[PDB]
């Protein structure tokens, strides 16, 4: 054959530049990014930066040619184009003064659905359960986010309803096996089909919203996460035989509209699920019911809230410096004891966590030689030096695990 060019094959065709891919797709960067997020496409590091390009040392992001080529045939592009055409037509109608025509046009529109995207991105339910970690982590945070100009209140309400559905299913299924509390929030873990899915529930305080973060990307991710969560919830309810979607409890919604509402029905096999069995609890006002109520409900206990009006209870939770009544029939407990019980999975004695006492720390449940190294090769010598430098940090951590722990105790 004729003289082939210096670099026009191999990495030069397997990867396509971001700008080149966008130009070939004839799609705006916003729409391309949305499609990428929906498909989960990501940039890849070429084996040789200067070989993928034509000797260019300038920075670049290399995508997979096959992935982009396959993405070009997805219906989502057609739906996006239809949405753009509908938007232009609605703008024309609004500018023409025919509000009724605009209302009729808008009322007859239908949005796209990502159901087929899920069946190809996560062909099997275990994969969806594995990847639901990020979806839960985002939805739980968005549930407590107050409504703003960047996100309509309907989206926040839908996210909160999805989170409530998930929490109710978990409590009824009692699949929770490990819990933890952190500054960033309260971590919850459930053995959903043995996948030990973990999610972080942030504190219910008013979530500060820094305007720097671009909500457009966040909303795009949240849409896919909400669809995935809805499908997973439907699948789980069908597998368990419970009705779906469960009906909200209007009577309970008036009081606190907490986890108690949204009752579910059909149509104790583990130490975690058997703890607190048949127990009745009373939560003081100052303790977060939203956090403790879920744990007790999953454990199979009963909780009486102070707001029940806004005894027979064998356990009481209060964080006040001084308890007022101290009825002998109620066992006063700090939430740290409840957390420790779930972490260990056994009924640790309650006498160690009386109110007002010290709070114990809470931990998560999860030349002889130099002589022979003179002749080592450059690669081996560098590897050994880097390994020693890395192990220096491990040794420092091991030393510090006891140094301060012993020094502070003496004072």
């Amino acid at each position: 054959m004729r003289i082939k060019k210096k670099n026009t094959r191999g990495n030069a065709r397997n990867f396509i530049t971001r700008s080149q891919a966008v130009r070939k797709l004839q799609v705006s960067l916003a729409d391309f990014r949305r499609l990428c997020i929906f498909k989960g496409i990501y940039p890849r590091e070429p084996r040789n930066k200067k070989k993928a390009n034509k000797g260019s040392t300038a920075p670049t992001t290399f995508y997979y040619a096959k992935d982009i080529q396959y993405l070009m045939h997805e219906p989502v592009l057609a739906k996006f184009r239809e949405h753009k055409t509908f938007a232009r037509k609605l703008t024309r109608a609004l500018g023409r003064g025919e509000v009724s025509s605009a209302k009729r046009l808008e009322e007859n529109r239908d949005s796209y659905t990502l159901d087929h995207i899920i069946k190809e991105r996560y062909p099997s339910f275990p994969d969806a359960i594995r990847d639901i970690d990020d979806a839960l982590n985002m939805l739980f945070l968005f549930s407590n986010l107050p409504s703003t100009n960047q996100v309509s209140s309907k989206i926040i309400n839908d996210a909160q309803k999805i989170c409530n559905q998930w929490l109710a299913y978990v409590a009824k299924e009692r699949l929770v096996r490990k819990v933890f509390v952190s500054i960033k929030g309260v971590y919850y873990q459930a053995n959903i089909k043995g996948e030990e899915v973990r999610w972080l529930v942030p504190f219910k305080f008013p979530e500060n919203i820094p305007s720097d973060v671009d909500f457009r990307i966040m909303l795009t991710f949240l849409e896919f996460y909400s669809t995935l969560l809805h499908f997973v919830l439907y699948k789980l309810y069908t597998d368990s035989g419970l009705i779906y979607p469960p009906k909200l409890d209007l009577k309970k919604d008036k009081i606190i509209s907490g986890l108690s509402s949204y009752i579910l029905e059909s149509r104790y096999d583990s130490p975690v699920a058997s703890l607190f069995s048949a127990f009745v609890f009373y939560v003081s006002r100052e303790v977060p019911i939203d956090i403790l109520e879920f744990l007790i409900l999953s454990c199979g206990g009963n909780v009486i809230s102070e707001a029940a009006m806004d005894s027979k209870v064998t356990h009481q939770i209060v964080d006040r410096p001084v308890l007022k009544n101290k009825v002998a029939g109620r066992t006063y407990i700090q939430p740290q004891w409840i957390f420790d019980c779930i972490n260990k999975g056994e009924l640790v004695p309650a006498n160690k966590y009386l109110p007002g006492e010290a709070l114990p720390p809470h931990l998560s449940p999860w030349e002889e030689k130099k002589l022979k190294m003179i002749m080592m090769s450059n690669k081996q010598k560098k590897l050994y030096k880097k390994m020693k430098y890395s192990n220096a940090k491990k040794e420092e951590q091991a030393e510090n695990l006891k140094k301060k722990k012993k020094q502070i105790a003496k004072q």
Partner: protein, 184 residues
Amino acid sequence: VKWPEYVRVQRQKKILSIRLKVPPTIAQFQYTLDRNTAAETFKLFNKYRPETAAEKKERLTKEAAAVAEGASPKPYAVKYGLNHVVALIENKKAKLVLIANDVDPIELVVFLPALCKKMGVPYAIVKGKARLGTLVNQKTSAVAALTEVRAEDEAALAKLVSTIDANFADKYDEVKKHWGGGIL
């Protein structure tokens, strides 16, 4: 540098129109009604937008459904068809006449203002046929008029006609003066 051929042609057309001397019959447009009175006229007309295809279909379907299970007054709307408007004018039936200043065939509407003046029917010229079309659910109409205004708005229409008289017919009664377009 270079520019699109059509862009250059249209740009040169504006210069030619500005510099070329036009007869008194031409340039009678662009001496349009003031912004305020034109806005008031459009506001009044918006209350009488003719029924659109969707609304008419909905009304007919509702009537059919009512009949299936088992005396409205005369409809009121603005008349905008050029042939229909011209047939209404010269019959002393139209009360207000609106004429667009940007009709592509100028000769198509040169006689309409003069015909209205001869017939004595009040008339006015407004900028843009697109504005007239927007209020009648059409791309363009080039003309607009009212024939049967509701009693509630009869006084408003009379006052608008009286104001338009002074605003346009009296201010531009000398539009027949020295040929326009005499700009260096």
